[PDB]
């Protein structure tokens, strides 16, 4: 707990609320990874104070190639809250966002609580259903250059999330094709195999990361497993669609200029 922790959390929370970028920490605002953890918690507390509640988790850096490119040794997670929800098939004004990007993901719905060091086996025993999804991510910082602690403090860019149809939990999601498209033309092509080599691996990691903060994946949680492709900058007046092999598609639009 510190004056700097409160000052940055509040600065990051108004960037989110106003949709205006905010500068990164340098020297005086330079933060510890441990400092970012506390800022991440206060950033969410700001949202819970406005009536939103925690509803899930999102994993970041869900590939060894990704951790390698950012020089990290583990993935980053973000907390999701009732206010980041987007109606599937709905519209979003880009005006309430700093510079949002869209990523295709696999989502798990927990039917039971999942806690600690779990096997893939035990992870899916607590899963109710599975679905394709798109995460809308938003770095609230202006002129951003990568620093690990900033993204942890900025809640791993959590901002929006949209999910598709219910699918049986035993569906094989290990290597499904994915087509993310703007106005029907593909912007990204890939497979859900991009998420740690097997999406259930991200569900296992989420229980590991959550236990680190003494937390757990509670019954009813929505877990965004991770990005199957690189994110794409969103623009106005577009139809954003995610199509997955054996999972159907999900969509949302952006308001016109």
């Amino acid at each position: 707990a510190a004056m700097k922790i409160s000052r940055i959390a509040q600065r990051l929370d108004e960037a989110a609320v106003s949709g205006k970028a905010t500068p990164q920490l340098t020297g005086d605002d330079a933060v510890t990874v441990r400092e970012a953890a506390e800022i991440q918690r206060l950033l969410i507390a700001h949202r819970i104070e406005r009536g939103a509640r925690q509803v899930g988790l999102k994993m970041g850096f869900t590939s060894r190639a990704k951790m390698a490119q950012m020089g990290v040794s583990d993935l980053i997670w973000g907390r999701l809250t009732s206010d980041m929800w987007v109606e599937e098939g709905g519209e979003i004004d880009l005006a309430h966002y700093v510079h949002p990007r869209v990523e295709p993901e696999i989502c798990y719905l927990l039917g039971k609580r999942l806690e600690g060091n779990v096997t893939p086996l035990e992870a899916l025993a607590a899963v109710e259903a599975v679905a394709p999804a798109m995460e809308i991510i938003d770095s609230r910082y202006r002129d951003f250059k990568f620093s690990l602690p900033d993204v942890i403090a900025d809640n791993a860019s959590s901002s929006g999330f949209v999910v598709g149809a219910w699918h049986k939990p035993e569906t094989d999601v290990s290597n499904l094709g994915m087509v993310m498209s703007f106005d029907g033309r593909a912007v990204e092509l890939g497979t859900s195999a991009a998420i740690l080599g097997s999406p259930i691996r991200a569900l296992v990691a989420a229980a590991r990361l959550a236990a680190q903060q003494g937390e757990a994946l509670e019954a009813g949680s929505l877990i965004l497993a991770g990005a199957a492709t690189a994110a794409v900058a969103l623009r106005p007046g577009i139809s954003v669609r995610c199509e997955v092999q054996n999972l159907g598609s999900l969509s949302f639009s952006t308001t016109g200029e």
Partner: protein
């Protein structure tokens, strides 16, 4: 009309000597003033050289199957290479390092042909009727040119950089197979070295096979019953090293392993 020129035979001979000596050579695009047509002629001379050595044309390989790759090479169309019985490998068989030359691996959908597509104006319908089954495949491309320094003239003259082709053992018919959203993952030592989907291969693997079927009919060498068509890259190529074991998985199609031997 002049595909059997002294210039072409010299270039073909150069690439052939490079393959036999296992020593790559300097690029040849600088010696080709005839365009991609002269490059195909050069490829053709080495195809006859292989036939005259008693080898069997077992199929074709399709290259430049993404607009991104066509754009880097300055083209708006794919390229094709000729496969032979000597280039074939089965899933899991040890690949002798002397069979490769600056090897790279790409996961692809292999389409086996069961009807000749000899006529002009081939359609998607002709191709569907002529397609028997599909197979998970890993193409092992190779380069007779030094350090993969290649333009469209270099690769087309060097058999579109074809090396080996690794095929799986279990066929799957097109009915009940979605090749557009088929997911692809290629791994080496538990790592995801290539990621893709069927749609990456020119939109659909049959769009590439249809392109090839008609290109071959215009070159006087159509696809034939039994020919295997390597339709194109589903993801990015990964450079291969001695002892490497790459495993490719195509959802709904199956898995296939390319095992490189050491030394």
């Amino acid at each position: 009309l002049n595909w059997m020129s002294e210039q072409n035979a010299k270039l073909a001979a150069l690439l052939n000597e490079a393959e036999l000596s296992e020593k790559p050579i300097e690029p040849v695009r600088g010696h080709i003033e005839g365009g991609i047509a002269q490059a195909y002629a050069i490829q053709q001379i080495n195809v006859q050289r292989q036939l005259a050595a008693g080898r069997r044309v077992t199929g074709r390989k399709i290259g430049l199957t993404s607009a991104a790759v066509q754009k880097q090479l300055g083209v708006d169309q794919p390229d094709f290479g000729t496969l032979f019985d000597s280039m074939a490998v089965n899933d899991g068989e040890e690949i002798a390092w002397s069979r490769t030359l600056q090897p790279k691996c790409e996961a692809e959908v292999a389409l086996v042909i069961e009807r000749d597509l000899d006529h002009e104006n081939i359609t998607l319908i002709d191709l569907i009727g002529a397609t028997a089954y599909a197979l998970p495949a890993i193409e092992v491309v190779g380069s007779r040119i030094a350090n993969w320094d290649i333009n469209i003239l270099d690769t087309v003259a060097d058999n579109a950089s074809a090396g080996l082709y690794v095929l799986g053992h279990t066929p799957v018919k097109l009915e009940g197979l979605d090749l557009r959203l088929a997911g692809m993952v290629m791994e080496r030592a538990g790592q995801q070295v290539s990621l893709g989907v069927g749609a990456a291969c020119l939109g659909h693997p049959l769009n590439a096979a249809l392109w090839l079927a008609r290109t071959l009919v215009k070159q006087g060498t159509p696809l034939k019953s039994g020919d295997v068509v390597l339709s194109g890259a589903l993801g990015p190529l990964v450079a291969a090293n001695p002892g490497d074991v790459f495993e490719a998985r195509i959802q709904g199609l199956g898995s296939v392993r390319a095992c490189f031997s050491p030394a």
